[PDB]
């Protein structure tokens, strides 16, 4: 199929998120991200992985 299947603008296929806050406790490590799916870019959560 030619149309309506894939864009032609600039889109990062895979992007890496660096944590915003990271607190290494005595026996655990908590890292918080702010993943921000852009506009008109539907993201499937199955592909995410730390």
């Amino acid at each position: 199929p030619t149309h309506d299947v894939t864009t032609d603008r600039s889109q990062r296929l895979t992007l890496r998120f660096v944590p915003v806050d990271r607190e290494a406790t005595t026996y655990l490590y908590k890292a918080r991200f702010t993943l921000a799916v852009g506009d008109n870019r539907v993201l499937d959560m199955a592909s995410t992985y730390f």
Partner: protein, 52 residues
């Protein structure tokens, strides 16, 4: 030219002051106006404040 300029005399107290305690219940009360839900051990959305 003495400590009167930048130092103040006061009554000694063994309590060494009375700081405030902050009570936070995190998952019961909705967060107040300008608090955001941070699961840091330190920061929790306070709900009330009292002297110790």
């Amino acid at each position: 030219k003495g400590v009167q300029s930048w130092t103040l005399l006061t009554t000694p107290d063994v309590t060494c002051g009375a700081e405030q305690v902050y009570w936070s219940l995190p998952d019961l009360m909705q967060d107040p106006v300008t608090f955001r839900s941070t699961q840091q051990v330190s920061n929790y959305p306070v709900v009330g404040a009292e002297l110790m």
